[PDB]
Scaffold this active site. Structure first.
Site, short mmCIF file in Angstrom:
data_model
loop_
_atom_site.label_atom_id
_atom_site.label_comp_id
_atom_site.label_asym_id
_atom_site.label_seq_id
_atom_site.Cartn_x
_atom_site.Cartn_y
_atom_site.Cartn_z
N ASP A 138 0.85 -1.23 0.00
CA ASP A 138 0.00 0.00 0.00
C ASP A 138 0.87 1.26 0.00
O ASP A 138 0.50 2.25 0.68
CB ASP A 138 -0.93 0.02 1.22
CG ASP A 138 -2.10 1.02 1.07
OD1 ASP A 138 -2.38 1.49 -0.08
OD2 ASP A 138 -2.68 1.29 2.10
N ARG A 142 0.23 9.24 0.81
CA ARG A 142 -0.57 9.28 2.06
C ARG A 142 0.13 8.44 3.16
O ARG A 142 -0.08 8.74 4.34
CB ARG A 142 -2.02 8.81 1.82
CG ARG A 142 -2.20 7.37 1.37
CD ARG A 142 -3.62 6.84 1.16
NE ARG A 142 -3.60 5.48 0.57
CZ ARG A 142 -3.65 5.17 -0.75
NH1 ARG A 142 -3.78 6.10 -1.69
NH2 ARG A 142 -3.62 3.90 -1.12
N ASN A 143 0.95 7.48 2.75
CA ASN A 143 1.60 6.53 3.68
C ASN A 143 3.08 6.84 3.83
O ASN A 143 3.86 5.96 4.26
CB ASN A 143 1.38 5.10 3.22
CG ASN A 143 -0.06 4.70 3.46
OD1 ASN A 143 -0.70 5.22 4.35
ND2 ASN A 143 -0.62 3.84 2.68
N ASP A 156 2.53 2.27 7.45
CA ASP A 156 1.31 1.53 7.03
C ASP A 156 1.64 0.46 6.00
O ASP A 156 0.80 0.14 5.14
CB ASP A 156 0.20 2.49 6.58
CG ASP A 156 -0.45 3.22 7.76
OD1 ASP A 156 -0.07 2.94 8.91
OD2 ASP A 156 -1.08 4.29 7.50
O1 LIG Z 1 -0.34 0.71 13.02
C1 LIG Z 1 -0.26 1.24 11.88
N1 LIG Z 1 -0.44 2.55 11.59
C2 LIG Z 1 -0.57 3.48 12.62
N2 LIG Z 1 -0.69 4.73 12.39
C3 LIG Z 1 -0.78 5.46 13.51
C4 LIG Z 1 -0.73 4.83 14.70
S1 LIG Z 1 -0.53 3.12 14.32
C5 LIG Z 1 -0.02 0.34 10.67
C6 LIG Z 1 1.43 0.16 10.43
N3 LIG Z 1 2.00 -0.74 9.56
C7 LIG Z 1 3.30 -0.63 9.59
N4 LIG Z 1 3.61 0.27 10.53
C8 LIG Z 1 2.46 0.79 11.04
C9 LIG Z 1 2.74 1.86 12.07
C10 LIG Z 1 4.28 1.89 12.22
C11 LIG Z 1 4.79 0.93 11.10
N5 LIG Z 1 -0.65 -0.93 10.91
C12 LIG Z 1 -0.03 -2.07 11.62
C13 LIG Z 1 -1.15 -3.09 11.68
C14 LIG Z 1 -2.28 -2.49 11.09
C15 LIG Z 1 -3.48 -3.23 10.93
C16 LIG Z 1 -3.50 -4.55 11.46
C17 LIG Z 1 -4.69 -5.32 11.30
C18 LIG Z 1 -5.66 -5.96 11.19
C19 LIG Z 1 -6.85 -6.78 11.06
C20 LIG Z 1 -6.64 -8.16 11.00
C21 LIG Z 1 -7.74 -9.02 10.84
C22 LIG Z 1 -9.01 -8.50 10.70
C23 LIG Z 1 -10.17 -9.50 10.53
N6 LIG Z 1 -10.25 -9.93 9.11
C24 LIG Z 1 -9.27 -10.99 8.79
C25 LIG Z 1 -9.24 -11.18 7.27
C26 LIG Z 1 -10.64 -11.58 6.75
C27 LIG Z 1 -10.61 -11.62 5.21
O2 LIG Z 1 -9.71 -12.65 4.76
C28 LIG Z 1 -11.74 -10.61 7.22
C29 LIG Z 1 -11.63 -10.33 8.73
C30 LIG Z 1 -9.23 -7.13 10.73
C31 LIG Z 1 -8.14 -6.26 10.90
C32 LIG Z 1 -2.35 -5.12 12.05
C33 LIG Z 1 -1.20 -4.37 12.12
C34 LIG Z 1 0.04 -4.96 12.72
F1 LIG Z 1 0.93 -5.25 11.75
F2 LIG Z 1 0.82 -4.19 13.51
F3 LIG Z 1 -0.34 -6.13 13.32
C35 LIG Z 1 -1.95 -1.14 10.71
O3 LIG Z 1 -2.71 -0.28 10.19
#
Ligand SMILES: O=C(Nc1nccs1)[C@@H](c1ncn2c1CCC2)N1Cc2c(cc(C#Cc3ccc(CN4CCC(CO)CC4)cc3)cc2C(F)(F)F)C1=O
Length: 306
Positions: A138, A142-143, A156
């Site tokens: 992704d 924006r990321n 992200d």
């Molecule tokens: O934390 C993040 N952004 C932030 N910005 C500000 C504060 S935190 C970003 C991010 N990614 C890399 N990095 C960051 C921040 C620093 C480096 N992340 C890490 C992150 C995020 C999301 C999830 C999620 C989810 C999720 C999983 C399963 C379902 C259900 N579904 C399973 C699949 C099924 C279909 O097959 C349907 C149901 C739902 C959700 C996990 C993670 C992580 F990796 F940490 F576990 C997310 O966004």
């Protein structure tokens, strides 16, 4: 607590204001107050939109440790996680916001040196993820977050896989093979890189603006691409066009993009043609609206002096 992924109690952090309301969650400005440590760390807190099972929560924790393990100046690290009815994710607060909003806001005071340096920085961050065997899936302006106007970081990269990208959606950033067959590789991230560069060089234009997402695979198959940004020499456009080759193995590699943009950054006016380039300046912490409008505590970087 010396854990690489901090497991936070709800008493250890506070949501203070909303930053952004995005596809899969809401991001807040807040403070992390690690128990007993008498210190307040400015953080971004993302609270996922959907409640997760104990089963979702296991896959989340495993991926979260990977996101807390990264250690590169051009990559945002996950500091911590809080698992209640909702999942909350905690990172250092990046007090100049995302680079897409930044280039839209400062489109009259951004010169060639800044644009090429950001290209280098993003390529270095992506090459570090490739070395970690991590596909972003992704990448977009924006990321990419702005730590200072001089220094940007990728974020992200931990979403798309868990949200089911690879099983039965940022179409306009996606490589053709990702659209057609859900193939995601470091080479599909190179395509997204090219679109991200396009967003920077256009000061935050929307790619294929007003073209329906359902029509993108067809126009890509016909050979159409994003147009040459007005500031770009053909030398810079040809890098973007090479990122969008149908043959993913023929696209540049991140280590080749570091070398080529670093070369361009040494003579930036040869490669980008910006009226007023030489006289351009960007607000510091002190002068920044956006900055004071978050902040005015110990920075995460100071607190974590390992
Ligand atoms: O934390 C993040 N952004 C932030 N910005 C500000 C504060 S935190 C970003 C991010 N990614 C890399 N990095 C960051 C921040 C620093 C480096 N992340 C890490 C992150 C995020 C999301 C999830 C999620 C989810 C999720 C999983 C399963 C379902 C259900 N579904 C399973 C699949 C099924 C279909 O097959 C349907 C149901 C739902 C959700 C996990 C993670 C992580 F990796 F940490 F576990 C997310 O966004």
């Amino acid at each position: 607590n010396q854990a690489l992924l901090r497991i936070l109690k709800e008493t250890e952090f506070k949501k203070i204001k909303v930053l952004g309301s995005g596809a899969f969650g809401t991001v807040y400005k807040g403070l992390w107050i690690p128990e007993g440590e008498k210190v307040k760390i400015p953080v971004a807190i993302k609270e996922l939109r959907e409640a997760t099972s104990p089963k979702a929560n296991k896959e989340i924790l495993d991926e979260a440790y990977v996101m807390a393990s990264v250690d590169n100046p051009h990559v945002c690290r996950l500091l911590g996680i809080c698992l209640t009815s909702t999942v909350q994710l905690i990172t250092q607060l990046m007090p100049f916001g995302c680079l897409l909003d930044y280039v839209r806001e400062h489109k009259d005071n951004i010169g060639s040196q800044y644009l090429l340096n950001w290209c280098v920085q993003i390529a270095k961050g992506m090459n570090y993820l490739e070395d970690r065997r991590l596909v972003h899936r992704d990448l977009a302006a924006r990321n990419v977050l702005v730590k200072t106007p001089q220094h940007v970081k990728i974020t992200d990269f931990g979403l798309a896989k868990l949200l089911g990208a690879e099983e039965k959606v940022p179409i306009k950033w996606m490589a053709l093979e990702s659209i057609l067959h859900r193939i995601y590789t470091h080479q599909s991230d190179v395509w997204s890189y090219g679109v991200t560069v396009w967003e920077l060089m256009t000061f935050g234009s929307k790619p294929y603006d007003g073209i329906p997402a359902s029509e993108i695979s067809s126009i890509l198959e016909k050979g159409e691409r994003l147009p040459q940004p007005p500031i770009c020499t053909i030398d810079v456009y040809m890098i973007m066009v090479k990122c969008w080759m149908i043959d993913a193995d023929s696209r540049p590699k991140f280590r080749e993009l570091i070398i080529e943009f670093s070369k361009m950054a040494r003579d930036p006016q040869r490669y980008l043609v910006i009226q007023g380039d030489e006289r351009m300046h960007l607000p510091s912490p002190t002068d920044s609206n956006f900055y004071r409008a978050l902040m005015d505590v110990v920075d995460a970087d100071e607190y974590l002096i390992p």
